[PDB]
């Protein structure tokens, strides 16, 4: 196990032993009041491609 008494390098658990963490990345919804989703996603519909 990785998070233990100095037992680093867990072979099957690569995403800890490597250095791939999300430092400041939270993920949850409802950041915005709802209908800006409407007013802005129905506004950037045209130019939403490459």
Rounded least distance, CB 4 to other proteins, Å: 9
Q: Which residues contact 3 (CB under 8 A, 6 or more apart)?
A: 16
Cα(22)–Cα(18) distance, integer angstroms:
12
DSSP code, position 39: H
Total residue length of the chain: 50
Rounded least distance, CB 11 to other proteins, Å: 14
Q: Could you say which residues in the range 1-40 bind other proteins, by CB under 8 A?
A: 3, 8, 14-16, 18-34, 36-37, 40
Instruction: Point out which residues bind other proteins (CB under 8 A).
Output: 3, 8, 14-16, 18-34, 36-37, 40-41, 43-44, 47-50
């Amino acid at each position: 196990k990785y998070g233990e008494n100095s037992r680093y390098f867990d072979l099957q658990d690569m995403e800890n032993t490597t250095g791939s963490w999300d430092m400041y990345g939270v993920d949850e919804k409802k950041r915005y009041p709802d209908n800006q989703a409407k007013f802005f996603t129905q506004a950037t519909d045209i130019i939403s491609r490459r």
